[PDB]
Each structure stands twice: as C-alpha cells, then as structure tokens.
Amino acid sequence: GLVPRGSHMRIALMQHTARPLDPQHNLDLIDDAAARASEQGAQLLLTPQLFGFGYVPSQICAQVSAEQVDAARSRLRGIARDRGIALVWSLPGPEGPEQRGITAELADEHGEVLASYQKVQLYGPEEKAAFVPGEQPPPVLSWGGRQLSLLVAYDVEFPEMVRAAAARGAQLVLVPTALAGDETSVPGILLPARAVENGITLAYANHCGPEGGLVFDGGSVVVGPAGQPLGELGVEPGLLVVDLPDADYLQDRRAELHRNWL
Template identity: 45%
Template sequence: MKLILSQVRPTDGDIEGAFRHVAMLFDLARAVEADVVLLPELFWPGYNRPDLHEELAQPLDGPWVRQLQAMARDAGCALVTGMAERAGADLYNTALAIGADGGLLARYRKIQLFGPMERAVFRPGDDLPPVFALGGRKVGLLICYDIEFAGHAAGLAARGAETILVPTANPVGFEHVQDTLVAARAVENAITVAYANYCGTEAGLAFGGGSVVVGADGRVLARAGTREAMLIVDLPGCADYPQEILSTQRQDYRAL
C-alpha cells in the first residue's frame, strides 16, 4: 500500500487553500500510483481556531465531505483527514477515511482530547477506533494524543489492524511523541504507524513537524523535518516481516 503523507502548515481557516492542497496531493497520487493520502488533525477548518470550529464545523453529509468524496473518486485514491464534525448540538474532533471510490470507509471521533481548547470545544468520542479494509489490508485510525495511550494501538492490533494512520497536531515541545512513542506503539504491536503532523504556526501555536512512518519492527521508514514535506512510502504489511518475530512481539507485550 503506497502512502502519501503531507506535513503542511495549518489551514488557519483557508478552506479554498485546503482544497487546493488536496487537489495537488491527488495529482501526485495519480503520478506515483498511491493508494492513500494522509493529512493532519482538524485540517478543516484548522487546529488552533476554536472560533472557526464552532462557526464552520459540518456534518458528514455536508459540502466538505461531499467535495472530498468526489475528489477521491476522480483521483482513484483514498484519503484520511481530520475535520471538525457537527452532530446536532455537539462538535467532534474527527478523522475520516474516504475510499478510492468516494465511499466513506470509516469515521473516528477522538477519544483522548488534549488540552483546554479541545476539551472546551469538542465532545470525546464514544466508539472504539475503527478497523477497516484499505489498499488490501486492515487499517485503523487514531488522532494525535490517542497514540500516546498504549491501549488504543493494542486494541486496534488485537482486532486485526496491520497499519494505524494518525492525523495529528503536535506542538513544539512534545517531540518525544514522534521520536519515541510512535515507534514504541509500532514495535509493541508489530504494526506500521504513520503519524502526520503540522509544521509552522497557527494563532500563536507552533507545531513541531517531525511526521514519521514506523514499520512493525520499530524501524523508521520515513521522517520529515520541521518544514513542509511530503513522505511517499510503500507501507509494509505483516507478510513482509518474519512471522516468528511479529508473533513474539505481540505475545510478549500482551502477556504483561
């Protein structure tokens, strides 16, 4: 499964610019025959903009999602992205997986809300992180702070996920997450983890970049620096690793 991970500056309310960026990524996906594009957390309408979350959040059948579904279908490439989701009077920090046919593969509402802003604006999700088929394998979703809790990744692996895709918005000062914890989650569960962060600043909040893709053996497959970057990675599946090693990793961790 070939992934394009986009480390980009935050949207900061520029919805048209966000769609232009996705169009560019889908053009690249056609050229390199990618299976899925991964974007950061709350790409629509921006992360550190609680004013815009309340003003602009949309339901899953709203114009943002409909346009993204049409774009994915036209490109023949799946998309995983974060957005502010409105459900009645409630707002959720949501990750969507849209298939190459434009269908909605999965929705995940962030469980582990981080910091005062998120907790003031969003409700935590009630459902387990999803596992779904994408690019010939089983994939799970988490969002940012979720990956720091070992049980979420372990639960996805226990339900058969081979890969976890993680839209994130990790600030400067928390680089231990992409430098250490992402690799720990990967090797604990013998699972590939792709972690897509922002760079630059938004409304006074600086992001650390460092987006990373880590294989099931804990090795870094690709890593971004602190500027805008695109990582194009052929993600290995479980069949690409010695089965005795993966089996030992999973059994040893789950026995603790």
C-alpha cells in the same frame, strides 16, 4: 521511482501549514497533494488533524457551522474520487457545534467512506471545551491487502488506544495529528514503541510551520514493526511517499487481568 513488482502498498503523507478558517485554501492544498501522491503511484494519502479548518479548536466551536463542515466533507469525498486515491482526512464531526467531536475518515479511491472514527482522547482544555470525546474503539478494516485502522493525534500517545486497534486486527494505523511545541518524544520515543509493542506499522501526518498561534513540529513519519522510520519529514512542508513491506505481545498479554488493573 518504479513501484515494486509484486502486490504491494505505497502510501503518502501530506505535511503542510493550514490557514485558520479558510477551507477553500486548505482543501486546495489537500487536492494538490492528492494529485501529486497519485502521480507518484501512492494508493492512499493521509492528511493532518483538522487540516480543513486549521487547528483552531475554540474558533471551530465558535465559527464553523455543521453546514460548513458538511461542505468540506463533500469536497474531500470529491477529491478522493476525482484524484483516484484513498484519502484519510480529519474534520469536526457532523453534529451541531456543541455535540460534535474531532473525527478522522477514510474514503477509498471511488470516494466511498469506508470508516469514520471520533477522537477518544481530547488534548488540553481548548479541545475539551470545543469538542465531545468519542466513546467507540478504533475501526479496523481491510484495504489494499492489510487491516487498516484510524486514531487521531493525542490518541496514539496512549498505549491502550493502539492496543485497542491491534486487538481488533490492525496492521497499519493511520494517524492525522497536529503537534506543536517541539515535542520530540511523541514521534521519537512513543511512536516507535507503539509499533514494536504491537508489531504494527504506524503513519503519522502532522502540520508544520506557523498556524493559529502555534508553530507545528512537522516530523511526519511512517514507523515499521521494528520501530524504524520507513520514511520521515523534518519541519518543512512535504509529501512523504513510502513503500511498505508486505515476541508475541498480542497473544501473550494477560488481557483479562490487565483490564482489571487500569
């Protein structure tokens, strides 16, 4: 509907089912979403974890080459530019299959890659066998008038990962994910706390429906600093569009002691 008059930020989250090992199908879905989000006045689209090749870690390790990942990455840079919308995607990283991790990248509407991040907290034995964990803290960068940051999936369930972003100035944390198994506690209990305990907004974009032997939960959501859903989806495919509004835990935490007690 009409954008708020001021200077403001409208984001979109793509929730959909990917087909394993079919990047032309999955990237076409991303392109469709990018066009629809831009038409609705969104300035950025967040898409889910490993959407381009499907959430199939062992198959990605066995079957998807670095040249194939690069071809999908160039296509995605192309969609950000061609649809004139900033885009956050998540693919395998650019190294060989035995060296790369799971990453998220943000390209601006000119297609320039502003930030790349490698998932630090791999989930379960198949991810750990298929991917190398990241060793770097989450990036934080100005975009659209706020400080954005990236994390991936299981990362957000650790308070330490969100705090690492908020410590570097993050105000809006964008999280591609792939969560199955009817795990309501992640978006229902953990996400609202990560928002409140840092005073930030988080956007969480999941797959939904049957894919690669799992049934994904959907439940994509944007949670504001009071832990309230600003918008949310259920279990069906959908494009969530949200207008964002413009204790001091982050000052008060005794970080020099906390660091010694983890």
